[PDB]
Amino acid sequence: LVKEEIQAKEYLENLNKELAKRTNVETEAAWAYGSNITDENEKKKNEISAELAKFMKEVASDTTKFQWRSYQSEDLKRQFKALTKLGYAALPEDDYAELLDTLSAMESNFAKVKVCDYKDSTKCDLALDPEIEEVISKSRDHEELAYYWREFYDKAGTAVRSQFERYVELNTKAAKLNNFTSGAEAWLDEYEDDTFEQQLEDIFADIRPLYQQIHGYVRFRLRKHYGDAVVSETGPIPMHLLGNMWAQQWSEIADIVSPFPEKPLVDVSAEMEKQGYTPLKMFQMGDDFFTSMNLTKLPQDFWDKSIIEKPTDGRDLVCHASAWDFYLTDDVRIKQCTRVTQDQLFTVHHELGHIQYFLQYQHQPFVYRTGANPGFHEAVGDVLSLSVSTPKHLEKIGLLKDYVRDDEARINQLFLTALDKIVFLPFAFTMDKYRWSLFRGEVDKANWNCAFWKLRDEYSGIEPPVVRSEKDFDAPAKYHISADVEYLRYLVSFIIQFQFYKSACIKAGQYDPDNVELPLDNCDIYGSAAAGAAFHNMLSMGASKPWPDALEAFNGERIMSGKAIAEYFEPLRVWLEAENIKNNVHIGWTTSNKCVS
Numbered sequence: 001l002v003k004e005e006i007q008a009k010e011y012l013e014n015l016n017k018e019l020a021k022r023t024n025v026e027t028e029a030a031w032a033y034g035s036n037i038t039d040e041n042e043k044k045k046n047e048i049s050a051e052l053a054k055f056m057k058e059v060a061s062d063t064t065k066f067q068w069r070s071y072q073s074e075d076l077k078r079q080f081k082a083l084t085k086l087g088y089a090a091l092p093e094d095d096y097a098e099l100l101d102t103l104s105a106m107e108s109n110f111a112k113v114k115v116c117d118y119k120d121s122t123k124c125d126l127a128l129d130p131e132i133e134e135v136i137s138k139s140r141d142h143e144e145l146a147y148y149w150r151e152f153y154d155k156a157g158t159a160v161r162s163q164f165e166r167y168v169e170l171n172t173k174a175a176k177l178n179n180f181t182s183g184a185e186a187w188l189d190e191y192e193d194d195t196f197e198q199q200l201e202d203i204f205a206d207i208r209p210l211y212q213q214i215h216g217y218v219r220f221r222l223r224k225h226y227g228d229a230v231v232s233e234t235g236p237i238p239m240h241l242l243g244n245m246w247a248q249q250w251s252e253i254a255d256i257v258s259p260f261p262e263k264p265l266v267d268v269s270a271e272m273e274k275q276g277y278t279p280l281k282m283f284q285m286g287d288d289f290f291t292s293m294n295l296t297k298l299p300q301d302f303w304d305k306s307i308i309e310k311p312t313d314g315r316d317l318v319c320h321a322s323a324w325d326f327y328l329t330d331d332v333r334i335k336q337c338t339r340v341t342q343d344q345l346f347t348v349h350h351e352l353g354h355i356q357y358f359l360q361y362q363h364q365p366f367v368y369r370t371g372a373n374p375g376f377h378e379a380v381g382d383v384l385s386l387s388v389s390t391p392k393h394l395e396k397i398g399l400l401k402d403y404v405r406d407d408e409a410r411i412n413q414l415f416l417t418a419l420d421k422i423v424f425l426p427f428a429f430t431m432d433k434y435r436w437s438l439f440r441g442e443v444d445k446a447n448w449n450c451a452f453w454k455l456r457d458e459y460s461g462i463e464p465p466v467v468r469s470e471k472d473f474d475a476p477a478k479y480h481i482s483a484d485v486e487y488l489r490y491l492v493s494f495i496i497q498f499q500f501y502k503s504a505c506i507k508a509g510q511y512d513p514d515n516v517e518l519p520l521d522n523c524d525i526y527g528s529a530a531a532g533a534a535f536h537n538m539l540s541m542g543a544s545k546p547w548p549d550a551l552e553a554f555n556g557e558r559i560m561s562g563k564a565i566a567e568y569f570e571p572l573r574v575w576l577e578a579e580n581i582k583n584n585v586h587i588g589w590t591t592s593n594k595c596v597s
């Protein structure tokens, strides 16, 4: 049994190596398909996934040869337990193949959406990225906005209802084969905490009043721009006016809702273009931020194999930005259809945070080469982006000029940041609240579409521009819903990234709550080896320990907390509460009239 444990340790070392080797090729096939959507690439991706699922079944069976619950090493026991968890690979081979086909159909559908131009309906080659996203972000023609909203949701959402239904069924079947009640419990398993969902309810409830104030002010300002017939005083905000196809962040309309329109609003896109920025330069700058913190420089494979601008050959691909670990040493890549904008610069850092994480844990055994939890993975790059976005940093790198950081400019900047960070929280929560409700069998198929919009109303106080019904199916028009990517990770990320940022800022000498010269919202951790060390300590652990141990390695904390994010926006909360009372701004909303059961 001491002998058996020694044998089990060698068995796991070899198994992890083999899993990394096989997953490398699965990842190559997935990369090929995602960068070039073809029936041939789809078939190879799905065959290799099927072969790997069959291997995982064998692995799970082989683990029963070892009396691993009697072993001394908690590490070995953790590895064995992770290797017993089959997920979708628990499905019978025919069901697994059908699930893969279903997922590919939805992903292909999303990637291939083309719409007709509003001004000339004979031009029908407008894609989400970049053409439709450009219109939704920049047009202030409410009819044009509503047209693109409808065309996109009809094609990206409604077209895949039947595939989505079958996916829900197979996801549920898989979950029950793994002894989870549903796919909701399967997803929640990744956080290794039986109170995790309630913890999020509690944090969300604390931040919700600030969201209500932001919502009310934005509606007030939208109504002043568009008039009562377009934006009602008391109803949910028509979502097509919020600058984003899913209304998940509202910073693209900052020029119609900024607190002080006479005072500066940071948008460095023009200066980036004036200075001849390219996607390459943007990625080089991100790399430089990480190396400035004494973290790992991007390896040669990254530069040689990444795709950092949209192809011009007219093939179909998934343009949704992503970061890829190929499970060797130093083979890590990003695929991004990069444009030279402030928003895209943040996305670059977001994706490079994933890459940094891959590099930091690449010597862990294969089973531990992943995030402490899914939210940790999403948070890394956003911590850097918070620094990148500060007037302090943008002035230093020459992208922001003639900027006086007076009280009004500060409110503009905090408000802009809140349009990205606070507004996203109810959005992110609803993406999984909706799917969990379907996974759990709590909504009859007859009510699936209005269940989606009811949640979007309840939590975000937004609604479609036009009346929808159960003849539409709108949820899959969000990438992650069509792609079967869990979304709670982003809610978790948006909370914990402020915990990481606050701690890194203190370690860098960039934040002191008692010093007016060092406010949290102007902290730049660029150049801080001390902040980098904290990242190294956490990120190098991968998934070797439960996430509270990874957090503790960073800053001694073990608890997920909304204190930091509230602290960041406290100056905005004070101003905004006073401003809404001053202007008699209506808070809250009536139930939406936009979904017919």
Ligand SMILES: *[C@@H]1O[C@H](CO)[C@@H](O)[C@H](O)[C@H]1NC(C)=O
Binding pocket: 036, 038, 039, 040, 041, 315
């Ligand atoms: C796209 O993939 C197909 C194989 O499915 C291939 O014939 C074609 O050359 C590929 N294009 C690129 C740019 O890789």
Ligand SMILES: *[C@@H]1O[C@H](CO)[C@@H](O)[C@H](O)[C@H]1NC(C)=O
Binding pocket: 294, 529, 530, 533, 536
């Ligand atoms: C920087 O990182 C290297 C590599 O991890 C480490 O050995 C060294 O201690 C760090 N240097 C500083 C100044 O923190």
Ligand SMILES: [Zn+2]
Binding pocket: 350, 351, 354, 377, 378
């Ligand atoms: Zn991400």
